[PDB]
Design an enzyme around this catalytic site. Structure first.
Site, PDB file in Angstrom:
ATOM      1  N   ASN A 190     -13.400  -0.338  -6.876  1.00 59.57           N
ATOM      2  CA  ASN A 190     -14.629   0.488  -6.580  1.00 59.57           C
ATOM      3  C   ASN A 190     -15.188   1.184  -7.725  1.00 59.57           C
ATOM      4  O   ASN A 190     -15.467   2.359  -7.991  1.00 59.57           O
ATOM      5  CB  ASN A 190     -13.858   1.658  -5.567  1.00 59.57           C
ATOM      6  CG  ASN A 190     -12.829   1.223  -4.399  1.00 59.57           C
ATOM      7  OD1 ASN A 190     -13.441   0.018  -3.932  1.00 59.57           O
ATOM      8  ND2 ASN A 190     -11.871   1.711  -4.430  1.00 59.57           N
ATOM      9  N   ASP A 223       0.992  -1.339   0.101  1.00 63.20           N
ATOM     10  CA  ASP A 223      -0.022  -0.067   0.125  1.00 63.20           C
ATOM     11  C   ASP A 223       0.809   1.309   0.041  1.00 63.20           C
ATOM     12  O   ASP A 223       1.897   1.120  -0.485  1.00 63.20           O
ATOM     13  CB  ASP A 223      -0.933  -0.169   1.076  1.00 63.20           C
ATOM     14  CG  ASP A 223      -2.387   0.307   0.776  1.00 63.20           C
ATOM     15  OD1 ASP A 223      -2.367   1.126  -0.129  1.00 63.20           O
ATOM     16  OD2 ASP A 223      -3.190   0.002   1.628  1.00 63.20           O
ATOM     17  N   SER A 252     -10.940  -1.584  -1.133  1.00 63.34           N
ATOM     18  CA  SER A 252      -9.381  -1.666  -0.272  1.00 63.34           C
ATOM     19  C   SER A 252      -9.649  -1.791   1.118  1.00 63.34           C
ATOM     20  O   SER A 252      -8.898  -2.037   1.683  1.00 63.34           O
ATOM     21  CB  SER A 252      -8.786  -0.333  -0.692  1.00 63.34           C
ATOM     22  OG  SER A 252      -8.026  -0.194  -1.869  1.00 63.34           O
ATOM     23  N   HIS A 287      -3.667   5.633   3.624  1.00 63.68           N
ATOM     24  CA  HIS A 287      -4.441   4.407   3.274  1.00 63.68           C
ATOM     25  C   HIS A 287      -3.693   3.161   3.683  1.00 63.68           C
ATOM     26  O   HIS A 287      -4.411   2.216   4.206  1.00 63.68           O
ATOM     27  CB  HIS A 287      -4.555   4.376   1.445  1.00 63.68           C
ATOM     28  CG  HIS A 287      -5.607   3.551   1.177  1.00 63.68           C
ATOM     29  ND1 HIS A 287      -6.658   4.119   0.249  1.00 63.68           N
ATOM     30  CD2 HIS A 287      -5.756   2.333   1.184  1.00 63.68           C
ATOM     31  CE1 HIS A 287      -7.164   2.908  -0.437  1.00 63.68           C
ATOM     32  NE2 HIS A 287      -6.860   1.974   0.562  1.00 63.68           N
TER      33      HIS A 287
END
Length: 279
Positions: free
Chosen positions: A161, A39, A224, A69
């Site tokens: 997404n 990430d 995520s 994130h």
């Protein structure tokens, strides 16, 4: 063990019903497992990690999560308030810059690093990789995840997404990894969650409270966010010896709550990640 007032997603993977608040889990809590969080990096200093998180590789000038994130998803994996496997080892692999973006060649390299770096770590219960990322379809990103998977790492990837079929997205569309979709606290498919036949499992992914950079917390949403739930689940189940790195996706799909999800388009599996914990 039982975490009262848990985030709804933790209580969700420990219950057959939505709307609970207690996260029931075995006291082993993923001890002896490692989860690579591929990430924006991890704020290992965050007290919710208790020194179980460390940055092992960066592809940018700093190993710091200047985005949040990666710190968030590592939090859902194994932070001690917001994590599934609250005793696991967290290795940060910063392939995304602090804008949450990153080139395919960098993402592939990060997956190949994890495939080799794990042979330097102490993960007797197995290795998990959590990939909260993913652009368009790429045969190279797909085969890098497959490489990482066949190298002995349970790979969990976000479906994406885009509210579309995930077969047009990588590493979501790679068949041999665990493609995770997102659901919300009322067992609906998340409005953003990608779907399709490549999907293997759905996780809590809407309004996921977890760690954030600066010693803070944040509630965000995305496939995520569903991926670390499954990665932590796999790490937790591997610690229990219930599955292996190679079988963990199928096991999590076999032992999942079937049929509980709404707005599951025809042809996409209807499986919510569930740990089947009994006291």
């Amino acid at each position: 063990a039982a975490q009262t007032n848990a985030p709804w997603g933790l209580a969700r993977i420990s219950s057959t019903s939505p709307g609970t608040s207690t996260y029931y889990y075995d006291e082993s809590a993923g001890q002896g497992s490692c989860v690579y969080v591929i990430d924006t990096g991890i704020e290992a200093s965050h007290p919710e990690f208790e020194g179980r998180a460390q940055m092992v590789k960066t592809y940018y000038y700093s190993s710091r999560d200047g985005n949040g994130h990666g710190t968030h998803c590592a939090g859902t994996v194994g932070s001690r308030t917001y994590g599934v496997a609250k005793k696991t080892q967290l290795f940060g692999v910063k392939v995304l810059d602090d804008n949450g973006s990153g080139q395919y060649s960098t993402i592939i390299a990060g997956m190949d690093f994890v495939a080799s770096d794990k042979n330097n770590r102490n993960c007797p219960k197995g290795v998990v990789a959590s990939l909260s990322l993913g652009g368009g379809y790429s045969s190279s990103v797909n085969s890098a995840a497959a490489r990482l998977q066949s190298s002995g790492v349970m790979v969990a990837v976000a479906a994406g997404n885009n509210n579309a079929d995930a077969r047009n997205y990588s590493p979501a569309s790679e068949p041999s990894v665990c493609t995770v979709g997102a659901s919300d606290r009322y067992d609906r498919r998340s409005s953003f969650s990608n779907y399709g036949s490549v999907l293997d499992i759905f996780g809590p992914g809407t309004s996921i409270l977890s760690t954030w950079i600066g010693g803070s917390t944040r509630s965000i949403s995305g496939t995520s966010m569903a991926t670390p739930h499954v990665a932590g689940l796999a790490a937790y189940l591997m610690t229990l010896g219930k599955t292996t790195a190679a079988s963990a996706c199928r096991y999590i799909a076999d032992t999942a709550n079937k049929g509980d999800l709404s707005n599951i388009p025809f042809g996409t599996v209807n499986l919510l990640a569930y740990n089947n914990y009994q006291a």
